[PDB]
Design a protein around this ligand. Structure first.
Ligand SMILES: [Mg+2]
Ligand SMILES: [Mg+2]
Ligand SMILES: [Mg+2]
Ligand SMILES: [Mg+2]
Ligand SMILES: [Mg+2]
Ligand SMILES: [Mg+2]
Ligand SMILES: [Mg+2]
Ligand SMILES: [Mg+2]
Ligand SMILES: [Mg+2]
Ligand SMILES: [Mg+2]
Ligand SMILES: [Mg+2]
Ligand SMILES: [Mg+2]
Ligand SMILES: [Mg+2]
Ligand SMILES: [Mg+2]
Ligand SMILES: [Mg+2]
Ligand SMILES: [Mg+2]
Ligand SMILES: [Mg+2]
Ligand SMILES: [Mg+2]
Ligand SMILES: [Mg+2]
Ligand SMILES: [Mg+2]
Ligand SMILES: [Mg+2]
Ligand SMILES: [Mg+2]
Ligand SMILES: [Mg+2]
Ligand SMILES: [Mg+2]
Ligand SMILES: [Mg+2]
Ligand SMILES: [Mg+2]
Ligand SMILES: [Mg+2]
Ligand SMILES: [Mg+2]
Ligand SMILES: [Mg+2]
Ligand SMILES: [Mg+2]
Ligand SMILES: [Mg+2]
Ligand SMILES: [Mg+2]
Ligand SMILES: [Mg+2]
Ligand SMILES: [Mg+2]
Ligand SMILES: [Mg+2]
Lengths: 61, 89, 65, 102
RNA sequence: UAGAUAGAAAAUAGGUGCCCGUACCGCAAACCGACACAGGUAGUCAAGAUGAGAAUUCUAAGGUGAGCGAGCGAACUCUCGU
RNA sequence: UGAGUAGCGAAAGACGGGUGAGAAUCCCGUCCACCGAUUGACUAAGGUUUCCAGAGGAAGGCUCGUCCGCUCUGGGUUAGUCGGGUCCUAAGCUGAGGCCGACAGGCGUAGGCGAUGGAUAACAGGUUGAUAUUCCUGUACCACCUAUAAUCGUUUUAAUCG
RNA sequence: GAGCUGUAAGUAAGCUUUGAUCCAGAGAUUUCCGAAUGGGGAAACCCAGCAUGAGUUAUGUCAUGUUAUCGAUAUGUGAAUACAUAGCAUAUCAGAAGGCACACCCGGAGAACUGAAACAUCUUAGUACCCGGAGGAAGAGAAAGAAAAUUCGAUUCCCUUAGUAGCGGCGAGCGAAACGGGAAGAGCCCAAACCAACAAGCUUGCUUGUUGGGGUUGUAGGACACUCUAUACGGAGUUACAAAGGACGACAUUAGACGAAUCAUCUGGAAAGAUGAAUCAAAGAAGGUAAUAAUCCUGUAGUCGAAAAUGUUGUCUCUCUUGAGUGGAUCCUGAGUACGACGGAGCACGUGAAAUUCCGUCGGAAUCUGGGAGGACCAUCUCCUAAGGCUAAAUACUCUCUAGUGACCGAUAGUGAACCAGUACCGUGAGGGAAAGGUGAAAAGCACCCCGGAAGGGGAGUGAAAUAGAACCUGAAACCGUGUGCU
């Protein structure tokens, strides 16, 4: 139950592929980082993806 | 509610010996307590109750033809009168 | 007793009638237990009378609301 | 049923075909009727029962209602029955004479 | 002790005190073993003679004669004695 | 079919008298034998009416059966003090918020549940076909309530509760 | 409209034309467990608080209501810590929960046996199972579409295209789409520019935010400016396009009513059969009745019927609501988006020359002289206008109700279950899982006598039949007996 608080960015599933094209299930996890932002006008430490943090679009306070 | 607490009198050899001893046996609602039984008897028969003993009887297996079942469970009270008497007949 | 007579009776009279019918039913059950009741249909009669009395009382306290 | 207790009927099928008699009982759930002197059965009665005397008792047994036919009040012939409405009341009518049966 | 509040009771007398279980089997024919099954089933009590003893043999209290018998007294098998 | 064959599951019975349509097999009696740290007496689980009385003999009972843990009918279990709850907690279980986790869910704090342990007031005798520290007799104890109370208190208190 | 108190017989006591029983609509009652919700718990039990009441001299006892958790909205209070923020307390909520129809739908996650005559890519298969979310349908949907002409004009579904084009250890296998023909059809609302009101920053410049108006696009549209048109005239509507009602009417469903017409004889226990002579038919569907009935019964064709509730509809009412053109100066037209790289996935398409579409990570535009697509890519041409939302119908399925149908079964069949079956029984449990229909038209179900303790039987009787006597129609074979002709 871990996802980006801002965008909902979360892990997905897919395959690891060998040179012989053998397939095993794997996940792509989001680049989530625990940051303190303003939630409902109050500080709160939440999981936010690096991309949601990019370009100062999320205010860390 | 007293008429609901008391269901019917029990008439058996042991119950008749008890009655000779001034002890009256009743089947009562399976949910009531000894105190409710005492109060119901005193209200219905205008007696003074010396004491009440009470006991439970499990459902008893009973057969009729090919049908198996059980009798109702019973709660039986034995009321010892302090003053007065009860005439069941 | 029938619903029309019960509806002519007053609320207090309905309650008193319920009490007296319950006492009558209780005496009938005791006679039946002791083996002294030949007219067993009185039990059902009185039970249905009580049911009708309670029906009418509930109807009245419903229409009040 | 179209036959009713007390009616005078003619037996149109059975051993008693042609006999006339009074309907003295009906069994609606079986569609059967009992007609005096019709369908006599001899039942073995034990004297040991609540009736001291016993033996062979003869009594009418029920007959299927479609084997009896109402008799026309005028012509006394067997007749089927229709229904009219007189002042909002159903009246059984003999289909041969048109007269009210009762 | 922090707290609480006019009132507290040695005694005397009187009264009130619910629900559940309680039968019966329980080293067993009633429990676990498909059985009225030589198995298994925690704990308590456990007398006399003998003896170190709860061993041994015979008894007490108490319980039991075991849910096919009657004959005969071969081979052979089993258990036992010489 | 095998075949009226294997088997009928640890053991000591005998006789007399009853009952009965019927008796090695049921009842009663005498003698005999067996266990006796027990095949005796309690009792926890487990079973769940198998318990008692009257009646029965199809089936069940490894035979028989008049008998039975079987069938039918009606009965039988009584508590302030015994064991459990209205007391306590152990392991463990559960678990508000909480932490973690694709979902499902997992973990876990406070708090609860949970005896196999801690606490906890009744004994002897009598009594039924079947219950008894439960019923009855006698004599107790515990908690609580009401009234009257020797005596003590009467607002920093000082009796009392805590 | 005459009987009735179920299976279910009996006895008893009763009910009922002053209208039972019974059938349909509505209502009242509806113990305890169970999401189970006062707390606890080994479901159907135990133990409480609070308020009010009953009872008692009082205690004990009892009745009713209420008391779970989370969420949301309010009110009060409020730590470290000053301001107030955790937090805490109270009140309200037809807020959630849990179930299921082993179906259908969308999504998360996702096998293996198997096939490839082995096996790893591939296949099985995005299947089974698990999980979440539904809805009566879901999903999709009003072109950044399909194409290449005289172009078409949302989506979905059927036929076809076609086992084609392609994909593929180019193996096994996988496998379209457009065009064409059909079912059904319906189109809309925002964001932004701009205008007005309000509040903060107080340049008290005019910036930000909220509300309302305005606006919705490719034939580029809108703002903006100007010119007409109207204050509901018209138009539209609770299936999107905003959202609640009311009155009346119709029809339908949930009980019912009427409803034609056959007699005789023969056989026979019984006639509906046979024979003879009749009759009705908008009714010759069917079942029953003592054998095979259009005319005996229940019905059928046809016609009629509703106090009440429900459903679907029509008209009023109600509610909401302006609609066009001209201009090209400026402005707006969805950004961490499109897109790119790496790693995956999805596209019939296995990374390939790989367009078209998604996920993770990192980087990262343009602004109508713009942007996307036509299977790498570039140019030209052509067609569209992404990065916001809604939307009925044609399609899928059947636990269920109503009426029906079958060259479907007929008791080892048909459901596992025609019968008291998910029972008995087996298992700690999940779970597995049977056998078992037929007297007779009618119970007329064998009075009475006899042997016998009973069971059972022999008579007698009922019945057409007992040789139909109770798992009682028929009654094959295996198998078991008795007698006997030949041996
Ligand atoms: Mg007790
Ligand atoms: Mg006991
Ligand atoms: Mg005992
Ligand atoms: Mg065994
Ligand atoms: Mg041991
Ligand atoms: Mg020894
Ligand atoms: Mg022999
Ligand atoms: Mg031999
Ligand atoms: Mg031999
Ligand atoms: Mg032998
Ligand atoms: Mg033996
Ligand atoms: Mg016994
Ligand atoms: Mg025997
Ligand atoms: Mg939680
Ligand atoms: Mg203990
Ligand atoms: Mg005993
Ligand atoms: Mg509860
Ligand atoms: Mg292979
Ligand atoms: Mg192969
Ligand atoms: Mg939809
Ligand atoms: Mg190759
Ligand atoms: Mg709408
Ligand atoms: Mg009719
Ligand atoms: Mg005829
Ligand atoms: Mg007719
Ligand atoms: Mg790639
Ligand atoms: Mg391209
Ligand atoms: Mg592109
Ligand atoms: Mg091209
Ligand atoms: Mg164009
Ligand atoms: Mg649709
Ligand atoms: Mg057959
Ligand atoms: Mg079957
Ligand atoms: Mg079957
Ligand atoms: Mg037969």
């Amino acid at each position: 139950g871990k996802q980006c608080f801002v965008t909902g960015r979360k892990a997905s599933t897919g395959n690891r592929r060998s040179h012989a094209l053998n397939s095993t299930k794997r996940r792509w996890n989001a680049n989530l980082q625990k940051v303190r932002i303003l939630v409902d006008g109050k500080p709160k430490k939440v999981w936010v993806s690096a991309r949601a943090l990019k370009s100062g679009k999320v205010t860390r306070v | 509610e007293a008429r609901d607490i008391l269901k019917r009198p029990v008439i058996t050899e042991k119950s008749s010996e008890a009655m000779a001893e001034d002890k009256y046996t009743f089947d009562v609602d399976t949910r009531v307590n000894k105190t409710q039984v005492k109060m119901a008897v005193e209200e219905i028969f205008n007696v003074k109750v010396a004491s009440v003993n009470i006991m439970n009887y499990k459902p008893k297996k009973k057969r009729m033809g090919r049908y198996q079942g059980y009798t109702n469970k019973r709660r039986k009270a034995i009321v010892t009168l302090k003053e007065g008497s009860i005439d069941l007949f | 007793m029938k619903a029309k007579e019960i509806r002519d009776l007053t609320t207090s009279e309905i309650e008193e009638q319920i009490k007296s019918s319950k006492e009558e039913l209780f005496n009938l059950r005791f006679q039946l237990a002791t083996g002294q009741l030949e007219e067993t249909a009185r039990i059902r009669t009185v039970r249905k009378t009580i049911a009708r009395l309670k029906t009418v009382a509930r109807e009245r306290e419903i229409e009040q609301s | 049923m179209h036959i009713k207790k007390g009616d005078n009927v003619k037996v149109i099928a059975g051993k008693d075909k042609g006999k006339e008699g009074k309907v003295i009982a009906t069994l609606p759930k079986k569609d059967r009727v009992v007609v005096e002197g019709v369908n006599i059965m001899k039942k073995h009665q034990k004297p040991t029962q609540l009736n001291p005397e016993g033996g062979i008792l003869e009594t009418e047994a029920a007959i299927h209602v479609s084997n009896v036919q109402l008799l026309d009040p005028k012509t006394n012939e067997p007749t089927r029955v229709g229904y009219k409405f007189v002042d909002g009341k159903k009246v059984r009518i003999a289909k041969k004479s048109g007269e009210e049966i009762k």
